[model samples]
Target chain A: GSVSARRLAKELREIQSEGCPVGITLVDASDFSKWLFTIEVMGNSQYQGEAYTLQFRFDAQYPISSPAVQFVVTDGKEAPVHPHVYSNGHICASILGSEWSPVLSVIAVCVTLQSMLASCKKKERPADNDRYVRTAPDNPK
Target chain B: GSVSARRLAKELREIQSEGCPVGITLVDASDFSKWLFTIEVMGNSQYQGEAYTLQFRFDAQYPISSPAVQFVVTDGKEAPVHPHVYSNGHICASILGSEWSPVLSVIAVCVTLQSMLASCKKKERPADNDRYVRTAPDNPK
Candidate 1:
């Protein structure tokens, strides 16, 4: 098992013990590399009526490497659309990728997503969307 | 400057103090948000005999977010036959992106690029060069 897998297992236990969001579930009991989380949007945000499902996949080396976290649009169909999301459900939040840190936990990620959806603007910039579209494979199981 | 920017700047300075082979200069000194660093690929790597310059741009919330880093190509006119580098100079390495830690300095990034160039299997990913070529910024500035 990879170090990342071990840490993820440990982290999940801690999160569960703390009674954080139970909606964020590990993909299976055996593999800690994959996870499924459903975050509900509230207030007047772009996705206020949506129940966005997030999928997280960590490679063999995580914490040391950023885990790939993204939302599932459909059953491998086109991505979903929101103020801050692409048609493929790739998110523009910084904490999920390059700017992520080891201190951030599953709880932090969920909160960030919540905040992002709450404050999103609907402008679809091509440059930003193109980057997200081009690299959607890094996440989503 | 923000704490993230200050931290990155401090880390970069420490990298220079560590006797690394690269030289870094600010593209916009007033704005620690933008920097231009020169990478001298040592003889140990495939990039040996060449020098490459990288342009890094940090978002308002940098370090906390990944800095957008791109390369400057020939005459600022797209790259040549180099592998490992995207036409726009965006690096695909883990260090500058996913694996980046706040503790990592600018020198660490240069070293990673150096090692990536060293470990590049030109024969392994033949399509990479063309992919980079195809994705290079149009009308290179």
Candidate 2:
């Protein structure tokens, strides 16, 4: 419908046709505004053997405005226990915030999450998980 | 040390402390001429859950002459099965060959391999694996 949506459609098709490096699977891409996907860490990291659901909510600004990404717990799926992740599915990764770049695609977000988990040394929640999740806006700014 | 060596030394130090994405682990950076490293795809892809060893052999004329890079099989670790990869660990990626760019760094090469495996749909050797492996020069020039 919009520029970002068009670009996302292209990326989705390419990902489906070629495959994604981060094991990104389209769970519910039918809705451009609220796309759902899953990613798995395929390394010998603490998050190995885990499948994480991700929710990407796009706005009109699209690439200009960073998509809201978080881990979704559905049907027994759980959020990754990371210092930057909250029990409520909010992720504090820089890419999703100040480091947002229009050049980054959904595939890049998936890859970034994969590497983030792979580099983690332990399973723990964000230090301010409770506070942030409580005060954070529904759309995460 | 030559300019290439000095540059490589800086990269080695940076990678050692800051690290690279794509789950790159420095196995041995002691020898700049023959550095050994291992990389694992962080996200689920065709090469997911696999760790591949890489060997980087730098010549005296490095930046000018691209390093000879290939997957190495050792300690029960095997080279990834890709249409561009030979069983003997010779990679057919253009970056390591004809499309070589002096500006590229070891980090770029590792990321390329990670993405290459991530985008693959099947595990199969190169079409001309046997012929290429046999005819390829020692330095792959």
lDDT of 2 at A41: 80
Off by over 4 Å in 2: A74-76, B1-141
For model 2 chain B, give the 10-residue run with minimal summed lDDT: B122-131
Query: Model 1 misses residue B117 by how many Å?
Result: 43
fnat, candidate 2? 0.00
Q: Evaluate chain B of model 1: give its TM-score.
A: 0.69
In order of the candidates, what TM-score does chain B achieve?
0.69, 0.90
What is the per-residue lDDT of model 2 for residues B1-141, given as tens digits with 9 covering 90 to 100?
779889899888889788778578778887779888788888777766778889989988887788899898656768898756777787767788777788898888888877877766556565335645676677655
RMSD of every candidate to native, in Å, equals 18.8, 17.4
| Model 1: lDDT of residue A60 | 77
* DockQ score, prediction 1: 0.02
